[PDB]
Structures are given as structure tokens and as C-alpha cells.
Amino acid sequence: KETAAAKFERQHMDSSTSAASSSNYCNQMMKSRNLTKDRCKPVNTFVHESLADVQAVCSQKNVACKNGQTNCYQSYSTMSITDCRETGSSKYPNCAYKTTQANKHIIVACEGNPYVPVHFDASV
Template structure:
């Protein structure tokens, strides 16, 4: 009996791990990938992107995320746009925020990025009144 219970617990944990690894976005993922407040100081925007992409786990030798945007504002500024919105809706801020857009320019031997700063509105995907995916930014 105990062995059967242990078996089902292991299966449940495996299923949970697989679902978490299958790209189901969460608010914590969103914060990790897209928020940097205050903006991490660096000598220039390119260096900022190279450091931040590696620090946040989006660039490894041979595996580089091609594009990522960091938003430099408090989390509450982005969660308010999701308040009382249906799950999976795309919501756009009325306010403009400082952002840094990092674009991959070389992937070998290491990931190298070109960075650009903008003051943009932000469009996010909302689930459970929280942003879980940064869809785009624009003037």
C-alpha cells in the first residue's frame, strides 16, 4: 500500500514538473525576464544587455534568446493594467516607461547583444490579474 502511494506521488510530481517546464508562463517568470528596477548600471547599453541576458538565464554558449526587453519600473505599475481583466487578454499601459531592448547580434562563441533604450508603452498578457508575458512595447 505504501509503495503504491509513493508511486502515485512520484507520478504527480513528475507531471507537475513537466507542466512547469512546458512554458506555462507565470508572474515570477515575467519578473525574472523583464523587470529591472532600478536599472542595473553598466558602461553602455550593449554591455548592459550582455550582462543582464546572462544574469537572468537567457543566454548560454550556443543557446541565445534572440530578443528581450527589460522594463525599468515598479512591478505595481504593470500589474495595475491587468486588474479585472480576463485571463489571456493583452493589455496596454497608458503610461510610457523606460525600457531597454536587447537584440542578439552574434551567437558564437558567446551570445552578444545590441542594446537600445526607449520610453515606451508596454503590452502584456494577463492571467489572474497579473502580467505573465511581455507581448510588445511601442511609442
């Protein structure tokens, strides 16, 4: 089955764009990354950075996750991110999202050897 690291990349990485280019970014990416296949994922963030730069966060500022786990890390630097959250009209299978561009620090949980992101905890 898909590894947790691989799921993070699929759900949260978009190294192919610098920022969201239109209001339909989230609608397209949520669909393309299969985040709307079974149900509308209600909120999701994409990170517009290289994979190596995001993986490197696992060596940055340790901080407890929202759920209290201690394997979370905050990036030293802000990153270009897109926040995707369901619109009030979103109704499976016609999932609809509001796209919000931001530059924020990210908080990720890390696991494994190599020690890499497996969960996107927050933008801050």
C-alpha cells in the same frame, strides 16, 4: 516549476535601474537572468519600473495580443524600457546583444488571481 508570473519578472523586470547604463547592459542582464543559458534568446525587453506599476497594466487598456489572445493590455503611460536584440556576431554560448533605450508604452498578457503579467507582448 517556475510560474508564468515569476518568469515574466525574471525575463522582463528591472526595477533596480532607471535605464540601461551602457552598451553592455543587455549582454550582462541577458546572462544574469539566465536568458542565454540554453540558447541565445533573440530579442527581449526589460522594463525599468516598479513591479506594482507593471502589474497595474493588467487593469489598463485591453487590446488583443499579437497572437490574437484577448488577455493583453496596453499601459496608459510610457515606461522606461531597454530593448535587447542579438547582434550579428552573437553565437552561442557567446551571446551578444545590442542595447537600445526607449520610453514606450508596453503591452503585456495577464493571467491568474491576482491578475498579473505573464508575457511581454510588445513595446509601442
